Amino acid sequence: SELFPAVVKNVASKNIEIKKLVYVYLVRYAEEQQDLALLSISTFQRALKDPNQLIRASALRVLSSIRVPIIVPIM
Amino acid sequence: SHAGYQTI
Amino acid sequence: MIHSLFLINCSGDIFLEKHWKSVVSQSVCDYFFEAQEKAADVENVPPVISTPHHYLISIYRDKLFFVSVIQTEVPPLFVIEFLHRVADTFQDYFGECSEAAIKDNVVIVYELLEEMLDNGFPLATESNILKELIKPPTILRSVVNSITGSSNVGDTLPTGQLSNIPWRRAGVKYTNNEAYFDVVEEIDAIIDKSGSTVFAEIQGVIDACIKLSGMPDLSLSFMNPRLLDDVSFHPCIRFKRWESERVLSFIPPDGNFRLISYRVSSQNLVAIPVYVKHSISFKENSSCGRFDITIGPKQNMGKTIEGITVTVHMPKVVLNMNLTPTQGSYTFDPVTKVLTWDVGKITPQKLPSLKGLVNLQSGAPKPEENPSLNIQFKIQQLAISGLKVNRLDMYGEKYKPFKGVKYVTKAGKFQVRT
Amino acid sequence: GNIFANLFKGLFGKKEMRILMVGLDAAGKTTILYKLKLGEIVTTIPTIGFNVETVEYKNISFTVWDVGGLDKIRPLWRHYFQNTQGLIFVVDSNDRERVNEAREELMRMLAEDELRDAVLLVFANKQDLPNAMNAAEITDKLGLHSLRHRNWYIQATCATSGDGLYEGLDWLSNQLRNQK
Ligand SMILES: Nc1nc2c(ncn2[C@@H]2O[C@H](COP(=O)(O)OP(=O)(O)OP(=O)(O)O)[C@@H](O)[C@H]2O)c(=O)[nH]1
Ligand SMILES: [Mg+2]
Numbered sequence: 001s002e003l004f005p006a007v008v009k010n011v012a013s014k015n016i017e018i019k020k021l022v023y024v025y026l027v028r029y030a031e032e033q034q035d036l037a038l039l040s041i042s043t044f045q046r047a048l049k050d051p052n053q054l055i056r057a058s059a060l061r062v063l064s065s066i067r068v069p070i071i072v073p074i075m
Numbered sequence: 076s077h078a079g080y081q082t083i
Numbered sequence: 084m085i086h087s088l089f090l091i092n093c094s095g096d097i098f099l100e101k102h103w104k105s106v107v108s109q110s111v112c113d114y115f116f117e118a119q120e121k122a123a124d125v126e127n128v129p130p131v132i133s134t135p136h137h138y139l140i141s142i143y144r145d146k147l148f149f150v151s152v153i154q155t156e157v158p159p160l161f162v163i164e165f166l167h168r169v170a171d172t173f174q175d176y177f178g179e180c181s182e183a184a185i186k187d188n189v190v191i192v193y194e195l196l197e198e199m200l201d202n203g204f205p206l207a208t209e210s211n212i213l214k215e216l217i218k219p220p221t222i223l224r225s226v227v228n229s230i231t232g233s234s235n236v237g238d239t240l241p242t243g244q245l246s247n248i249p250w251r252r253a254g255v256k257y258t259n260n261e262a263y264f265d266v267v268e269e270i271d272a273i274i275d276k277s278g279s280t281v282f283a284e285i286q287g288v289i290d291a292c293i294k295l296s297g298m299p300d301l302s303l304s305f306m307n308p309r310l311l312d313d314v315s316f317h318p319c320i321r322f323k324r325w326e327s328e329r330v331l332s333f334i335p336p337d338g339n340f341r342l343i344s345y346r347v348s349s350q351n352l353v354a355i356p357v358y359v360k361h362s363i364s365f366k367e368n369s370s371c372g373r374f375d376i377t378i379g380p381k382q383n384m385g386k387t388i389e390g391i392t393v394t395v396h397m398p399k400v401v402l403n404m405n406l407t408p409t410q411g412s413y414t415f416d417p418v419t420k421v422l423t424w425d426v427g428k429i430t431p432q433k434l435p436s437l438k439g440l441v442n443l444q445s446g447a448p449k450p451e452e453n454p455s456l457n458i459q460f461k462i463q464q465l466a467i468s469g470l471k472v473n474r475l476d477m478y479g480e481k482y483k484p485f486k487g488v489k490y491v492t493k494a495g496k497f498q499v500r501t
Numbered sequence: 502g503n504i505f506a507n508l509f510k511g512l513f514g515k516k517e518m519r520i521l522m523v524g525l526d527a528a529g530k531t532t533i534l535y536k537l538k539l540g541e542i543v544t545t546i547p548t549i550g551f552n553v554e555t556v557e558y559k560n561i562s563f564t565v566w567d568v569g570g571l572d573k574i575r576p577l578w579r580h581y582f583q584n585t586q587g588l589i590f591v592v593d594s595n596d597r598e599r600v601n602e603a604r605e606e607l608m609r610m611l612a613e614d615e616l617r618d619a620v621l622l623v624f625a626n627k628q629d630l631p632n633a634m635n636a637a638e639i640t641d642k643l644g645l646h647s648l649r650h651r652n653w654y655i656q657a658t659c660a661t662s663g664d665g666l667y668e669g670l671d672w673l674s675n676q677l678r679n680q681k
Contacts, residue, residue, distance in 0.1 A: 005580045012553050017234040021190075024197060028102070038574050042550035054240040061201065067105075070573075074549075080263060080487025083475050 004033045011040045023062045031067040041071060084157045085165075085203040086137075088196070091115070091148040092182050093125055099185055101196055103203050107152050111137055115150055131159060142166050145180055153203075165205060172199065175210060175339075176219050191220055191235075211252050211336050215241040248298070250319050251336035256296040260484035262335075263292040264303075264475070268347075268467050269495030272355060276500045280355060285347035285468050286495050293335045300478040303331040303342075306471040314345040334479075347468045354382035354467055356492075357391075357460060361501050363441070365400070365449035372441040372449075374406060378426055378458070379434040384465055389428035392459040393437075397422055398450040406439035413437055456499040466490040514560025518677045521581050523610065524591035525570040525603055529626040533591065533660040534567050537670075542661070547571070551581075558667070559674050565589070575606075582615035587622065587677045589669075592643075594625045594633040594657070600642045607643065611651065620676050621653040622669060628659035652676060 007025050010018060030037040047059035064075055087107040090099035095116060097109060114134040122128045125143050132139040140162045141150040149166045170180040172195065177184035185192055198207040198216055207213045218224055218235040227233055242253040266289050273281040305311070308329050316322055320343070321332045331343070347353070358381040364373035380388055391411075397420040404415045404422065411425035424437050475486055507515065524530050526547065535543050538554040548569035555564045568578055590607055593599075610616055625639050636657045640646065645655060654672055658665040 009553075009581075012551075015232075015234075016238055017236055020194060020197075020236055024193065031105075035574075035577065036580075039550045039568075039577060042548050042552060042569070045546070045549065046552075052238065054238065065202065076263075077261070077485055077487060080489055083264070083472060083486045083488045 001029045001032060004029055004036050008036055008039050011043045023058075026062065027065050030065075034068045034070065037066055037068055038070065040066075041074065045074075084153060084155075084162065085151050085200060086154055087152040088166075088200075089148075089150045089152070090182075090185060091150055093146045093148070095119070098182050099189070099192070101193075103200060104154075107137070111139070111152060112150065115139055115141065115148070130163070140166070142170070144170055147180060147182060165200075168208065169196070169199060172210070172213065175214075188220060191217075194236075209250055211250065211338075212241050212244050215252060248319070248334055250317075251334070253298075255337055257294045259294060260296055260480075260482045261294045262301075262475075262484055262486055264472070264488035265290045266466055266470065266472075266488065266490045268470075268492040270353060270355070270467060270492065270497055271495040272353065272497050274355070274359070274499040278358060280353075281500075283353035283355065284349055285353055286344070287347065287466075287468060287470065288344040289342045291335065291340050291342055293337055293340055295335075295477070295480065295484055296482065297480050298334050299480040299484075300332065300334050302474070302476040302478070304329070304473045304475075306473040307469065310347060310351075310468055310470055311345045312348050314343055316343055317341060347470075351468075354384070356381055356383045356388055356462060356467070357458065357497075359456060359458070359499050361453075361456075361499075363453045363501065365441075365443070365453075367449040368446050369443055369449075370445040371443050373439075374404060374441050375436070375438045376424075376456075377434060377436040378429070380429050380431065383429075383462065384467070386462045386465045387428055388460050388462055390459065390461040391426035391428060391435075393422075393424040393426055394457040394459075395422040395454050396420065397454055400444050400447040400450060401441060402444050403442040404439065405442060406437050408437045409433070409435050411435065453501040456501060458497050458499065459494045460497075461491065461493045463491050464489075465492050467492040514557075514562070516561040516678050518561055518563045518587055518673065519585045520563060520565045520587035520589055520673070520677075521578075521585045522565050522567055522589040522591065523570070523578055523606075524589075525593070525596075525599060525606070526572075528570060528591040528593045528596075529660045530570065530589075530591045531567055533624065533626065533658075533666060534565055536660050536663050537565075537666055540663075549574070558670050561670075561674060561678055563670065563673070578610070579613070579615075582610075582613050585616065585619055587673055588616060588619045589622055589624065591624045591626055592639060594627045594639065595630050597634065597642075600639075604643045611648070620673070621648075621651060622673060622676075623653070623655040624669060625655060625657040626660055628657050628664055629661060 007022065011022050013019060026037065026040060044059045044063040048056055050056055086104040088101040089097055089112055091097050091112065097112060111134060114132055118132055119125065119128050128143065130141055136154065138153045139150055140153060140159060141148055142163060149170060151162060151166060153162065173180040173184065173192065176195065177188060195217060198213065200206060207216060216237055224235070228235065243249060243251050246253060267287065269286040270283065271286055272283040275281050316325065319333045319335060324330050324332045358379055360377040362373070362375040366372060376393070378391065378393065399420065401420050403417050406413050408424060411427040414423050415421070426435050429435060472488060477484070522530055522534065531545060531548055531552065532542065534552065534554055537556050548567060549571065551569060552567035553564065555562055566581055568581055592603060623643070625634070625636055627633055634642070636655055640655055645653060656665060656669050656672060658669065660666065
């Protein structure tokens with residue numbers, strides 16, 4: 001969890017392989033680091049508008065898995 | 076790999 | 084459904100930790116460990132264990148325990164089949180579900196689990212789709228990945244996922260068009276002390292390897308379908324045509340594939356290919372006794388019986404054994420009192436046997452029964468049920484693929500009393 | 502010795518320049534970034550997390566992080582202070598109402614040791630508004646000439662037209678890509 005603020009910065013990376021790895025990390029610790037997790041929100045929001053539905057779905061899933069009360073309206 | 080199989 | 088998953092080796096160690104709904108404390112595994120300790124064997128550990136706040140559903144397989152954590156009511160078989168399927172998936176990607184395979188491919192298996200289970204609900208479940216979502220760890224591919232930066236994760240939902248044939252991929256071609264069929268039968272039998280047949284039935288299953296280009300429509304029919312009953316069908320099969328035509332029409336999935344399974348009705352006497360002559364003498368409180376077993380052919384249908392193994396679990400009075408085999412190999416484990424005889428195959432010129440004396444515990448009384456016999460064997464080129472395939476036809480494609488089928492019968496639950 | 506790999510990059514420009522973009526809500530920060538990245542105006546909603554884009558200009562691979570101006574995440578900017586080189590502060594040229602806040606937060610960042618060595622470039626965005634503050638007025642409201650031991654400059658601009666966005670980079674191409 002101490003790596004959270006360092007990891008989250010790569011949420012916007014273009015390397016899909018990394019993206020998946022990042023999502024895992026976020027799922028594991030976002031509930032605890034609720035403030036830091038907020039940084040990933042826009043990435044998901046943009047991803048949800050992408051023409052690639054596989055990506056949209058992935059974004060949807062990950063977004064929903066973030067257990068932060070702040071983003072309820074968003075979800 | 077084809078060896079041993081009955082032609083069908 | 085599922086809150087979390089722990090992979091536990093029979094040693095009592097935790098190797099793979101997953102969480103989908105929330106983080107579950109590792110201390111929940113103590114309830115399993117307790118149960119494991121109470122049980123005299125890993126096979127006898129209850130598959131369902133209730134704890135103060137969690138329900139533990141688990142599967143023992145290949146020295147691993149798949150222990151899932153569920154906090155609400157979920158149909159046990161739903162969970163069991165699911166977890167079992169996961170282990171099968173690991174076998175598909177890494178040859179077998181083993182702790183070594185897991186620790187050597189942690190990231191990969193971690194990723195596979197994330198695709199298969201979504202917040203406790205089944206997501207990626209069909210092999211061929213999953214194979215495209217995440218490429219199998221081929222060393223050649225990993226080289227390419229280090230060279231080009233290519234991913235193992237795809238970026239396009241496999242077309243088959245949204246097709247009317249979800250069990251398979253689309254646009255797959257082979258230059259070597261072929262299809263292999265494997266009819267495997269198992270003999271389930273209970274033989275008593277006298278050598279009489281107590282109970283017997285035949286369990287069959289037909290697997291196949293499909294390397295056919297495009298979307299061929301296979302049609303499998305039998306010469307004697309009347310012998311099939313209580314047949315299971317993979318969903319890809321057009322059941323309706325099975326009923327109205329008695330024909331297995333379907334467009335199969337790529338690669339390794341199980342098609343159907345069936346039972347042979349008890350109305351027909353199940354031929355028993357092996358008979359056993361036996362005698363074990365236990366004098367009460369004696370320092371030794373006698374052991375004599377002979378394995379021979381019976382209803383072998385003129386075929387060779389091979390790959391024969393005899394396993395016996397001896398009573399605590401047995402300390403060791405003085406046996407001489409006629410072939411294969413005699414061994415005995417004095418720690419767990421297990422007698423194992425590698426028989427090999429039967430040649431009619433002289434039937435195999437294992438004979439000698441038994442080293443017993445002096446002062447310890449003779450057992451009330453002799454241990455039952457667990458015997459393995461295989462006969463190639465033989466479907467003991469007599470099941471024979473009539474035709475294998477293909478529609479929709481133009482090539483003329485290699486068509487091949489095998490018939491083989493192996494020991495099923497074959498046990499003999501004594 | 503064999504330093505070609507670096508010489509190779511030098512043949513086309515190895516220069517990068519890590520730049521953090523900060524400011525308050527509705528300043529036009531995102532708009533700016535994407536006009537520089539893409540050139541076109543992309544329909545959007547308020548930034549909640551952060552974005553990041555890389556733009557090559559004058560053989561410099563400028564990378565900019567768009568960390569939202571939302572107060573709910575504002576303090577998280579500290580995690581982006583480490584290892585930056587340039588600092589973009591975007592100013593809404595007619596937002597007199599929150600200008601004290603803008604200045605204050607700017608000063609808070611200016612007091613940051615991780616940013617101590619950073620170069621400050623201020624963008625007086627929305628130059629095209631009829632009631633926009635001019636550079637002088639903005640400068641005065643920010644009190645930029647009171648700055649000491651700090652490399653700074655203000656540049657007026659209009660992201661809608663791209664008026665001087667390149668110029669901003671031009672200044673940075675001499676200040677971030679300075680003599681060393
Ligand atoms: N009139 C005018 N509007 C502008 C200009 N630049 C940006 N805007 C508008 O200002 C609004 C806010 O722009 P954004 O880029 O979303 O602002 P931001 O700084 O990214 O805001 P946060 O994401 O909350 O940090 C949008 O409606 C833009 O179109 C400009 O130069 N002139
Ligand atoms: Mg923004």
